[PDB]
Design a binder for this molecule. Structure first.
Ligand SMILES: Cc1nc2cc(Cl)cc(C(=O)Nc3ccc4c(c3)CNC4)c2[nH]1
Lengths: 39, 156
């Protein structure tokens, strides 16, 4: 049996850690909701 | 039980100790999460019970107590914030600029931040604090890293 616990508020925080690149990927989505790369 | 708006951890006691299997959003009395987190199973909030209402395996989304309410969308230009809720660690906002998933049916946003599988269902926000989608369903690139899609549902 699964249960839920509060983890916080949903708000934008100014001065947050800015990280991560922005890649353009060619992807496919199957009937099972699974993404896969196409090259 | 507790239906206050906010981000929540999805836990289970079936495995060893208390294992976090995912995350979700409580907004307008409806709990939104990814289908692979709960598999459509009923959730518990203290003494209260949350029963599934809508779900789809291809979209990988599921809503509890009512229909999907989140309908904000990434504008295709701005930076976004992933409110990451990692297992055993405190909720944390990580700002990033999303990439693109080019598909046969159209383009989708993508956040390139690697987090444990238990972080699945953590919301992605715009500068207004609106939920533009959920993190947790994506792909593994040549670098071994994880690039998730910005998965949003539909509000009728
Ligand atoms: C290497 C890796 N890192 C991850 C990080 C996060 Cl947050 C999730 C995942 C992850 O397995 N997602 C996931 C799992 C099952 C299904 C779907 C998606 C959709 N169809 C069913 C990760 N995998």
């Amino acid at each position: 049996d699964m249960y839920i616990e509060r983890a916080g508020d949903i708000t934008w925080e100014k001065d947050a850690e800015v990280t991560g690149n922005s890649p353009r990927l060619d992807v496919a989505l199957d009937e099972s909701g699974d993404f896969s790369l196409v090259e | 039980g507790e239906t206050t708006d906010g981000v929540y951890r999805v836990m289970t006691r079936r495995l060893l100790g208390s294992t976090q299997v995912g995350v979700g959003v409580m907004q307008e009395g409806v709990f939104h999460t990814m289908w692979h987190v709960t598999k459509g199973a009923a959730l518990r909030s203290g003494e209260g019970r949350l029963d599934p209402y809508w779900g789809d395996v291809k979209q990988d989304l599921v809503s509890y107590c009512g229909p999907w309410k989140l309908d904000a969308a990434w504008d295709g230009l701005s930076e976004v914030q992933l409110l990451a809720v990692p297992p055993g660690e405190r909720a944390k906002n990580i700002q990033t600029l999303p990439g693109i998933f080019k598909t046969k049916d159209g383009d989708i946003g993508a956040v390139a931040l690697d987090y444990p599988a238990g972080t699945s269902g953590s919301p992605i926000l715009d500068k207004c604090g609106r939920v533009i989608g959920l993190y947790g369903n994506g792909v593994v690139i040549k670098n071994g890293s994880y690039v998730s899609a910005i998965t949003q549902g539909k509000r009728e």
